[PDB]
Design a protein around this ligand. Structure first.
Ligand SMILES: NS(=O)(=O)c1ccc(C(=O)NCc2c(F)c(F)c(F)c(F)c2F)cc1
Ligand SMILES: [Hg+2]
Ligand SMILES: [Zn+2]
Length: 258
């Protein structure tokens, strides 16, 4: 019926209901490292997640989102290529059916096992809904996940997946510290883009970290046990919930490092 990642309702069909899919600043894109422009005027990123308040985790039929209380400047992102304070509202992942695919952004055509998106909205706009009507309304921090050693800080997320196996299910998920998902370095690439899922709105200053975090095979395997379907419907494993790379067109990807 509506949108998804299957053969009959996947990314290639999105343009029919969301014409912006063929827009000028669509995401994700391939990051050509030799064409990215080192911009020495970019400030370092400033991630202030010490007061973060996670509230819930839910399976929305497309991915699982961990939501945060964004009623106050509790967990924010500023600095980098951003002007203003962006508030963390939630994070989710995109992953594949196999270790060699899953990320949305690619680096020199290399695909990672998954990609974490920490979604933030520009506070000057009042609420998330208004931010999605502005060219600089959102800032998504993207982090690549490669399969290797286990990420301790990701385990609490992994263990709770059993209780939100199907579409629509949710579970209280308090006291989760998102700082446990950050890599060691905050070096990044940035470019103007969009939401990678419908409505595909062209807001979003993408901030993709250079350094991937590593998770274990067992950790990513639990992601693959989730379902796209609701309880009582035919089981469809939630895998490959990623959108292929879009044409860069008239945009330049800047890097904070050389
Ligand atoms: N993969 S990603 O690029 O990081 C991405 C992040 C967030 C969303 C999303 O929040 N959809 C919900 C949503 C909207 F996109 C709205 F524009 C809106 F007004 C809403 F109320 C709403 F719930 C979609 C894709
Ligand atoms: Hg917009
Ligand atoms: Zn995403």
């Amino acid at each position: 019926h509506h949108w998804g990642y299957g053969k009959h309702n996947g990314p290639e069909h999105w343009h029919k209901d969301f014409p912006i899919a063929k827009g000028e600043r669509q995401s994700p894109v391939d990051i050509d490292t030799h064409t990215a422009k080192y911009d020495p005027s970019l400030k370092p990123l400033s991630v202030s997640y010490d007061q973060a308040t996670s509230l819930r985790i839910l399976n929305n039929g497309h991915a699982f989102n961990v939501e945060f209380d964004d009623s106050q400047d509790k967990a924010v992102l500023k600095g980098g290529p951003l002007d203003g304070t962006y508030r963390l509202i939630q994070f989710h992942f995109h992953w594949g059916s196999l270790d060699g695919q899953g990320s949305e952004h690619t680096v020199d055509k290399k695909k990672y096992a998954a990609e974490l998106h920490l979604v933030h909205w520009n506070t000057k706009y009042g609420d998330f809904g208004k931010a999605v009507q502005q060219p600089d309304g959102l800032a998504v921090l993207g982090i690549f996940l490669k399969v290797g050693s286990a990420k301790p800080g990701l385990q609490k997320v992994v263990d709770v997946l059993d209780s939100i196996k199907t579409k629509g299910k949710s579970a209280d998920f308090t006291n989760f510290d998102p700082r446990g998902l950050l890599p060691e370095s905050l070096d990044y690439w940035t470019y103007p883009g969009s939401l990678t899922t419908p409505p595909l709105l062209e807001c979003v200053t993408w901030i993709v970290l250079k350094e991937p975090i590593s998770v274990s095979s067992e950790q990513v395997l639990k992601f693959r046990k989730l379902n796209f379907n609701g309880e009582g419907e035919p089981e469809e494993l939630m895998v490959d919930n990623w959108r292929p790379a879009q044409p860069l067109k008239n945009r330049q990807i800047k890097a904070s490092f050389k």
